[PDB]
Design a protein around this ligand. Structure first.
Ligand SMILES: CCCCCS(=O)(=O)Nc1ccc2[nH]c(C#N)c(C)c2c1
Ligand SMILES: CCCCCS(=O)(=O)Nc1ccc2[nH]c(C#N)c(C)c2c1
Ligand code: NA
Ligand code: NA
Lengths: 414, 414
């Protein structure tokens, strides 16, 4: 059956990446900080933590706020994720040399966890106060969850499809998966793909912490996100947004673009087990990893690196450990970037995909922070202490979102 | 290049359909009503129209409300679209004979326009009143827009992927498109696909009517939705939710299922022109129709029927008329079901896909209501007056949502 290795699918490569994180607005500066063991998780100086006395007092805001780049009109015309999307879309295109592509062969796939939710309550108040004629004619285009992808496609002139997949923590990775499908199926030759997500606020914290899914180690904020560690106690919020430019290898050579890595395959499965909790056996999540290898043309032996979902919840890490074993990749070097960057829901899958690309390019994996006592039930070779330089040829990025959505992206060194 | 006609793609057929509309909760009763010229659009006895003195006083609520089938627990555990999804998912499976499929080969793709938006403001109030511990642990799984698809996949046991595409009015059609992709790419053999959407309320009416996109013919509610008519003045809301069961032809023969029609191809393009308005030249929208024919293996001559997007806005119908001309399908018989069923955003593309399947099965197209004075600039052969019985071999369903999202589904008579 067709595969990228046997020529069944056209070769797709990553040619540009961009991300804003709790470490830095510059993806290369974030990469450097991760290698130095830096963490973006700190104590929250926000007034809503003292106002509600939240159980969670830790999390990482963006190092460079999005609205510090937004004028009066952008604060008027777009939602937050649309503002983040326009900012990241412009940085990505300039970083790629601002090429002139065929719009009819240019697609955009940007995932998100919720959408323009804050614009719902704004138009909600604007009518309760003054009536229906006080809701802006731009309200519809601000609230629609496809708005971020629509803003990016309109800004860059993408006419081969503008899509927005929704799947909680796997939204960002699934967007890259569908952009890869849009190319190998012949519907496009170049695609901007990634994920955006809103900022940290009181209601997201309350909703997720009521599931006992978040960490409560407020005394040491940098030490709280402990994926695969035995003293973990949930995940930590870490604001992020990431986009990458993918295109066929022949499209990259024709415009003189230096590819950063290869996008080899993508697998999408589902648990059908629980509305928020992952399946303990990790069979379907591991099947997503296997599916990405089949479309790539690889076997579990070729996988040298696994960028794990690793949220640091007790049940999540244990389920992924079984998933990696089911996929036969338990000999690979594992990295859990949420140990330093936290969880950004709809954008984290895209961010960790960029980190996977940077790992293959530089042949180095940053250390998983706070991994000090290995969980006995979780026996995996995770990188810790200091960066591990290695000959990493192929890597798989995992993203298992709430609702049982499993997405695995197979990446290869260029 | 691979196609369904030349064996490049496996043959996919529709084996079961289900929908709740403003006409009837039974899809066959809705089909009968459409053929008799019935309309689901009436005057709104809702108190919010008199409360805000809305410019729009027309629209069609569901003939059978969703919550009339929902007990105390369902009103506690799920959002509206999740409640609609669970209801439609159960009706679809029973209508298909309740088969036992391989869960690892069973996928679900359900689109929606917004998600569990009303659960945001509920948890918003529940914390303002009593604090963070008053938000339910089920709040996360109710608000996530992937919730409707997640509820259906968990109810039916779909483990080959649960996806939720967001693209406004094309969400329902795009879901069927990705489910067709999930099958022909080998990731699944059977898929439940469709769209769900929330009910008519004051804020959706105010937001869309501020764009001058809705009809104001409140004196004659049944006469207001006039797609391709010269006295049209916007669209009319019509609540709906629809799901269909698609599977490979060999999967349908192995379980003794009578196919209703064939799903032959799907094309997804984007305008990249305006945040809400369609491109006047209709080039990209028509390209989506052409793309569905290429994947199907057909040419514009084979298209006997076009289930038009036809919202009855002045700019929308004119843009689609150019799109049909660009695709070379302007000789086909056109049907605009929004003339009788209205617009249901994220669900209407799925509903009109079911109507396309029923048209090919019964060889008849219902009359486009209120089409009495053809627009001079719009010269197309639309069905009107009474149902037109014909030898319809192939049909294309159009869905051009806000944001420039164009999806065309190519269907063939079985
Ligand atoms: C770092 C991860 C935080 C989770 C965010 S989220 O999962 O809850 N989704 C979401 C989407 C859009 C949003 N806009 C606003 C405003 N203002 C908020 C709070 C917001 C949240
Ligand atoms: C018939 C078409 C109407 C448009 C609906 S919509 O496009 O505005 N999307 C949406 C999604 C979920 C919702 N839940 C609730 C409640 N309660 C509402 C009002 C709602 C609306
Ligand atoms: Na990962
Ligand atoms: Na249609």
């Amino acid at each position: 059956q067709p595969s990228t290795a046997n020529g069944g699918f056209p070769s797709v490569v990553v040619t540009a990446v961009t991300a804003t994180t709790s470490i830095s607005p510059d993806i290369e500066s974030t990469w450097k900080g991760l290698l130095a063991g830096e963490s973006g998780i700190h104590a929250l100086e926000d007034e809503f933590v003292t106002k509600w006395d939240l159980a969670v007092k830790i999390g990482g805001h963006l190092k460079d706020p999005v609205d510090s780049h937004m004028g009066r009109l952008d604060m008027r015309r777009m939602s937050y994720v649309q503002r983040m999307g326009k900012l990241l879309g412009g940085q990505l295109w300039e970083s790629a040399g601002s090429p002139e592509v065929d719009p009819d062969r240019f697609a955009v796939v940007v995932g998100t966890g919720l959408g323009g939710a804050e614009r719902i309550v704004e138009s909600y108040d604007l009518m309760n106060a003054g009536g229906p004629r006080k809701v802006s004619p731009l309200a519809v285009q601000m609230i629609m969850p496809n708005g971020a992808a629509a803003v990016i496609g309109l800004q860059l002139g993408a006419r081969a499809g503008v899509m927005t997949p929704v799947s909680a923590c796997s939204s960002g990775s699934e967007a890259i998966a569908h952009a890869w499908r849009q190319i190998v199926m012949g519907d496009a030759d170049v695609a901007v793909c990634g994920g955006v997500e809103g900022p940290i606020e009181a209601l997201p914290i309350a909703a997720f912490s009521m599931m006992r899914a978040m960490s409560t180690r407020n005394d040491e904020p940098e030490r709280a996100s402990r994926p695969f560690d035995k003293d973990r106690d949930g995940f930590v919020f870490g604001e992020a947004g990431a986009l990458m430019l993918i295109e066929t290898e022949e499209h990259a050579k024709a415009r003189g673009a230096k590819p950063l890595a290869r996008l080899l395959g993508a697998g999408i499965t589902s648990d059908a087990f629980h509305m928020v909790a992952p399946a303990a056996d990790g069979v379907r999540a591991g099947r997503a990893m296997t599916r990405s290898l089949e479309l790539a043309g690889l076997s579990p032996a070729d996988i040298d690196h696994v960028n794990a979902h690793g949220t640091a919840t007790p049940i999540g890490d244990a389920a992924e450990a079984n998933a990696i074993r089911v996929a036969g990749c338990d000999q690979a070097a594992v990295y859990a970037p949420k140990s330093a960057l936290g969880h950004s829901i709809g954008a984290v899958g895209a961010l960790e995909s960029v980190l996977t690309v940077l790992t293959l390019r530089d042949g180095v994996i940053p250390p998983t922070l706070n991994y000090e006592t290995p969980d006995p039930e979780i026996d995996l070779d995770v990188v810790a202490g200091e960066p591990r330089y290695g000959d990493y040829r192929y890597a798989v990025n995992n993203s298992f979102g709430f609702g049982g959505h499993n997405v695995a992206l197979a990446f290869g060194r260029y």
